[PDB]
């Protein structure tokens, strides 16, 4: 690469010494830049050097081949971000809402459910739940998820699902048909939903409970990809 870049450029007298000085300066710069991130590890630095060589050699030019400072300014981009990495998901609509419902089930307390989703009128005299009186100060999303039941998951999934697009035979609310259960099984088999782990689980038994295995970033991306404001449910307890 450097041979190509210099044959595409003009002459460079004192070739060997200047070349060695350029290499030493590059090594010193990369060490001083990423020592606090790679530690005293020879292998990580030896990989970063190879990673960031083909571009630094492209950024050089004749007017700063002998001026290290100006060359350093011209290649400041590849000295700040390490960049050592290679819709987020392609799930269906009902699975997309099913994951959100499972997250809500896992990271919320049942006693305060009625205060968040009751949205219909009453004929018989009755009262709703008063709700929480004080906010938690632990931000529960920093802890391990809790366990729930299939019935609560289905109920909340029905509650938060968007309304379905002579109304005596409308049946506005979504019902749990075959494909909902099929998509729930698909979610489980992709390791996005866990259960009480033992060999040869039997899905049909009261002694089986589920939980979630995705971090906050994935669920936030999924919620924002379907125009859902999940944070409003968690901002109240703690931002």
């Amino acid at each position: 690469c450097l041979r190509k870049r210099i044959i595409e450029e003009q002459i460079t007298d004192c070739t060997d010494d200047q070349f060695q000085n350029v290499a030493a300066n590059f090594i010193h710069l990369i060490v001083q830049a990423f020592h606090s991130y790679t530690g005293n590890d020879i292998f990580a630095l030896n990989d970063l050097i190879d990673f960031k060589w083909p571009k630094y050699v492209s950024r050089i030019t004749k007017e700063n081949i002998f001026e290290p400072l100006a060359l350093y300014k011209s290649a400041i981009k590849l000295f700040l971000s390490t960049d050592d990495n290679l819709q987020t998901y392609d799930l269906s609509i009902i699975s997309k809402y099913l994951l959100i419902a499972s997250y809500i089930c896992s990271y919320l307390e049942p006693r305060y459910d009625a205060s968040i989703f009751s949205r219909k009128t009453r004929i018989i005299q009755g009262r709703a739940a008063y709700g929480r009186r004080k906010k938690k100060e632990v931000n529960p999303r920093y802890l391990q998820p809790s366990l729930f039941a299939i019935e609560r998951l289905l109920a909340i999934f029905q509650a938060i699902f968007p309304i379905q697009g002579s109304a005596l035979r409308e049946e506005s609310l979504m019902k749990a048909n075959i494909e909902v259960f099929q998509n729930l099984s698909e979610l489980h088999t992709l390791k996005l939903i866990a259960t009480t782990m033992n060999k040869n689980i039997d899905y049909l038994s009261p002694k089986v409970r589920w939980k979630v295995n995705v971090p906050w970033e994935i669920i936030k991306e999924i919620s924002e990809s379907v125009h859902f404001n999940i944070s409003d449910y968690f901002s109240d307890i703690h931002e």
Binding site: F43, A44, D47, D84, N85, L86, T88, Y89, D90, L190, P215, I218
Partner: peptide
Amino acid sequence: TNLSNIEKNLRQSTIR
């Protein structure tokens, strides 16, 4: 599903 899970599950040296 996606390679984001692969990135977040494996170690860092193996990704490099």
